Design a protein around this nucleic acid. Sequence first.
DNA 1: TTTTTTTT
Lengths: 276, 276, 276, 276, 276, 276
Amino acid sequence: VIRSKTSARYMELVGWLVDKGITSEKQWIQEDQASYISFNAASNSRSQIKAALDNAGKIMSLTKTAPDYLVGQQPVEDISSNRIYKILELNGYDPQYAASVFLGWATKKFGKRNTIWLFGPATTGKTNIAEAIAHTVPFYGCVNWTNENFPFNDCVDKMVIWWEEGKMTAKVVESAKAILGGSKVRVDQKCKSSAQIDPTPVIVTSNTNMCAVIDGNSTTFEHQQPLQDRMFKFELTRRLDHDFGKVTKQEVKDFFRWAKDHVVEVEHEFYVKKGG
Amino acid sequence: VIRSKTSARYMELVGWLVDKGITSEKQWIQEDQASYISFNAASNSRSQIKAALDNAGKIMSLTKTAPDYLVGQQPVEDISSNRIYKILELNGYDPQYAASVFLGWATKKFGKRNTIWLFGPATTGKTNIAEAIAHTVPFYGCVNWTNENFPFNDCVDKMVIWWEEGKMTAKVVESAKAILGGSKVRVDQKCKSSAQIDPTPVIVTSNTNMCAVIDGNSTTFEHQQPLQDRMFKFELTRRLDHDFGKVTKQEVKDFFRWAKDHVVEVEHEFYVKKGG
Amino acid sequence: VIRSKTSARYMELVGWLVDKGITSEKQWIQEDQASYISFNAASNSRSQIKAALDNAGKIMSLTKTAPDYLVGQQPVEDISSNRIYKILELNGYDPQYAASVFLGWATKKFGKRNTIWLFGPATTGKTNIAEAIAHTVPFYGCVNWTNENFPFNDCVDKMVIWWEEGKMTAKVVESAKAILGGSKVRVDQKCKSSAQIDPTPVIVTSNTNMCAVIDGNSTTFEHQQPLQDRMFKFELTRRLDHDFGKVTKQEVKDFFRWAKDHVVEVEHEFYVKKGG
Amino acid sequence: VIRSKTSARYMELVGWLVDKGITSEKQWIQEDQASYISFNAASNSRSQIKAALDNAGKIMSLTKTAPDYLVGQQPVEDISSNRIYKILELNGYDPQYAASVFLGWATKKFGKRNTIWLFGPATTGKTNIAEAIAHTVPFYGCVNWTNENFPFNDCVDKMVIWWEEGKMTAKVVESAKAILGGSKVRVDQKCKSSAQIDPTPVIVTSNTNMCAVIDGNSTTFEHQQPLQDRMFKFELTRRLDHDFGKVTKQEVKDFFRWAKDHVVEVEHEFYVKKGG
Amino acid sequence: VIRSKTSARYMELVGWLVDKGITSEKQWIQEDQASYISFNAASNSRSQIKAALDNAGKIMSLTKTAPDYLVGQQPVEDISSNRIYKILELNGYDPQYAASVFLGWATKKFGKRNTIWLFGPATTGKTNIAEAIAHTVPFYGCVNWTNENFPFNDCVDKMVIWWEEGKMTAKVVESAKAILGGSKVRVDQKCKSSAQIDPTPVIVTSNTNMCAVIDGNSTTFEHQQPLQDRMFKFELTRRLDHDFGKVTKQEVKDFFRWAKDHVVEVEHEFYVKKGG
Amino acid sequence: VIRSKTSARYMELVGWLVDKGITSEKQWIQEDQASYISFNAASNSRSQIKAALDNAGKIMSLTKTAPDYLVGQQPVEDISSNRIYKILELNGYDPQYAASVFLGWATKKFGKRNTIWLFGPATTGKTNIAEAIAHTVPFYGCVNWTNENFPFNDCVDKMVIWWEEGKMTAKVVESAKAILGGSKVRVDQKCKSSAQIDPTPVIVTSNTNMCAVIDGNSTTFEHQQPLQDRMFKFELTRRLDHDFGKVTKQEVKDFFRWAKDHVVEVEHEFYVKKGG
DNA sequence: TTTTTTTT
């Protein structure tokens, strides 16, 4: 367009911002507080940095998918060096079956039933694994319960989505059913801000059974069949011992590589048994 | 008049975006992220791109009709190759009658009876058709229930409208009744804004009874006669097998071509039977 | 006043917009596609365009009124060949009496008793007639029900206001009574703003009995006599089928001229008699 | 201090607009639409006209009040010329006592007891008198019940305030009690906007019973004693003649002159006696 | 730091503001409308005046405390010259004891017990004394029910804050409890704002019963024990007289000077006896 | 990176602001209003100071932690000067055990159980200890129970969080559970603003029971294992002396130094025993 | 050649 001096400066800034992959303020701060202060002083407003971060995020989300961030360069081929393996084996779940299920969920094998739901207390190997998976992926969104006008504000073009425990009201049942269906749909934000959402893997980190439509005090089961047909079931109950947690990304990468190296065709089974 | 460099660059950008048919954000990104970064480095503000997108959308909405870029140019001459045709055959609906109904709905043959209802659960053959309809239209409006102010925050003169079910208050019911009548009504956007909504075809993907008005604990349906008189229906409850899925745009193009080719007289039948 | 260079250009632009008849964006785009190009070559801000539109609308509303152009010179040349006359004779009301009542409503001979009321079944098709009447008038407003903050946003210093269907709460009922009660008064328009209101005709499109003040769940009757003491009682019963509404801008002016050519004395009768 | 050209032109325009004492815009339009269009074309600072109107209103509200502007030019001495005496004669109220009470309320004789309570719908003609007095005073305010955050947004540093009919809630009882006391109280608007309101005369234009403490669902009368002791009473019910009303400023000036010519000492009396 | 023309200009403006104690708009208007108009015509963007007013307010709040605005320059040493003295002695309380209690409360001697329970309706004259105290010092706070959720919008960076009568529901009960405890806390303002409230002198006035914890629909006394533990008791009941009110600031200044002159060691007594 | 005069000035200002650590703007004002006015004169906008405070807070929250502002320099070896020692001696809590527990909680050692729960009435003196702890830490946040839409407004990017007394409503129970888990969660702010919160310790300062989930009208005792095992138990009910509060930071520093001098092995234990 | 803010 202009390719003058300011254009070249902004181009080199975008290059130095996207060469390593930084979309948060703290990341760029820890990378180079010096350049951060220099850019903050060499600008009257704070909209240019926000636009650059948004462009970098859109580029890293459209060009790079999700399984590319789960590739393994060197497997470990061990069963005792991974805590998640022992966690899934203590509940009777098959390792190869769970690996194939995770591979099909991450790479979107089915599409319609792309929803992972858990049952049991969150302090028995749930919140720690969720935090580890959210830290392993550079982009992650969560559906909180604090915002009442729009609970889907922190999930705008993300690689993975998290759904905490909570009996959703009837005003968001259709929205949740359309989000879990897996389709790039257009949703607003608050005021003059509409954006599209691409099919992305979701994980329901709930504690109880949210399939029943529970609105305050009304317990209806009119949408139980579509909810059961659009989601899976991964119920497990086991007292996970303390002095653990905080799963590193190395074990996650190793398990993802083991799942990618062993592809097993899994049929449409809702009630996943505890065999293996 | 002045025809400075800014107006020339704006005209060049308009020509470049209309030469391929890109009036969004992610499409232009995937097309030429390099050119997008160059344009963002050129202009220092963020209102120029907004005005460009606004006038481009206005031109695309106030020029040619939707079927002009939705109809096909090659028939299929088959009934088992397309997934939508197989679904319509298994549902009992006549292919020629459904094609004539779709042709009359797209070209606004009736005007007042511009409603496509989907009675029954959505996970019974409706998901694939809904996905194909949503992916066929480039720019369409949606009515989400997450907005607690205006249900049409993304319907600023679009091609087709997507509708969802749920708890319907009096305001949204009156808005739907005014929209179904086909009238460009000037209504406020959200806050300190207003727009003139143009009569556009709508598609409802309900699950239960959409004619009933349910609000918390109040169930009213006294005005069901005008609602059922100013709307159509398409009840279907056939199971949709897995494996195959995700209908693209070629099937919709072939269906529109077959509808435009074979001309079938459209009747005023509200309660459509399951024969043909 | 200062007499500069931009003032003459702004005056010429205002005169060109007034002579061409451009008050919003729909006609602004439908007139010529080079208007946006000329604007971009001249300046680069939508605030100037919005101010031009605002002052042009203010000039058109202050200099001339609605009956100044609603009654043309070309008559109808046929009393029977008229859709409005046809539906009026089908409803059973008096033609000359209704014409004189409409004439008194247009000139506001009563002040506090000048409000059009439409009551009856929805099978006749009053929505299409209301849409046609609203489209034949360039300056018109409607009561918005989606937001309870500022329900009177499009009817700011307009010529004719339109109402929706159903009931409303007391907070908006009082404002409606103050507006249609024949009293030039100012009220909050937008965010931290105010706008005056002149006794202008209001058309209620409520097909049900709006005299029952229902505040969402409690049905009251203390605001029924003063509500009915501000407009004439109207009640029509007729069942139609198809082919109704969507009239041109010439038949309305022909009917207006035919009604003006026949002046009938009207007293202060509440319910309009169906004799004649 | 600065003494420039733009400041001199702004001061000249301010003096020209305050020379006649007009704070509206329609008067200036009807006077010289040409000069109005010239000033609109010469005003492109989107802040100069706002500051001009702000300082003009501040000068109009800081110099003289409103009742002093309602002084009579010549005494008429005729009970048939003033149309406001017929209502008092029909209702049996004392004309001289009511005139003295109104004169004491306008000149702030009692100080705290400076509020008149009304009782009557549109049939009594109180709304017409209120509209006439509001049109007589060049600047007034009205309480709107449509606002939810701040209902007194259109009543900040005014001359005379009107109270619309409506059951007060718990969120406005304290505000009304603080306003009735008369004090320069600082209150916020809607978002990042605060102002200090001066003790200003208010008057209630309620149609039904308002003194009864009806807060949502709580009906009490314990808080009625302060409202009865902080204001007088003026309840009357009498139907109008044959579309009688339309009072200008000459009648108000004549009434004020007649009240000033014959001043009657009025003590702290709540229930006004009848006789005249 | 460059010492330019605008620098010296706004420095002289801030000096003139802090020399006379002007922090609002009407004060500066009455001080010098000429300079106000000159400054409004000099700069177009209205922000330099608000910044100067905020700086002057912060300077007056940081340099000058609350007791510095209460002590006078000439004592009177008389009991038959102050109206508040007669008001407090009509019940039977001791003047010197109440003066010493007020002096200890204004100096924040206790800290935790910084609230005095004042029982009595509007007939006791609490509103007049509250208005006199609020007008004596240019910085005051009023806990009125005008605001929605956060009524402490005009209490931040102030001195004396007077409460109002109102059944506080489950909204700001915990905030008030933390405020009366004598501890600064960073709390949010109205919306999209936050500020650190410091232990400021507060006086709670209850016309009816406010000590009971009325949370929505539950009337419990769980939070009442610390309430009565961190506050005293001062009940007064006396009917006011006619032609009395509007206490000047000089009376309160002389009262505070006499209180600072003669001091009395105040211990800890809840049920204050009516003697002395 | 350009490195100009304004950039160097902003860099030196940031250096002079973060050389000692400044939180809000009132601290910098009271420190050097001279240089504050100099900086206000060097510029014109009011965003440079905001950006300076923002980056200073970001640096203080990212680089520095919490124990860095909690460690002391030399123990004082006293048993009567400290108040927490007397509190734990009168209640029966173990000195070294509680010291090691607090040291492990402040230095983030447990991870999953990095919280502290308090129980008992507020009349014993917990408010003074909470104020002292909040003053010992520079950056801290509190749960504002006023705004029901988002009570965690001031709890974004803080070293420690405080939880006031209030019922655990189901709309915030899930957010509180996610906060207790300890994960950098991305949540919205107030309007069109989102931020990522890092695992920060929280301290409950309630006086009622937090086991049974009470939502004002409903009560549930089902989901309680995670929220009951993700915290400890430190209750106290012994009342201290009268007017005994306002603790400085020297006592806290001495206690932290004494705890660091003698470290006791901390183990996972909910119901703490009394043995010291 | 110089700039603007939203809900029960």
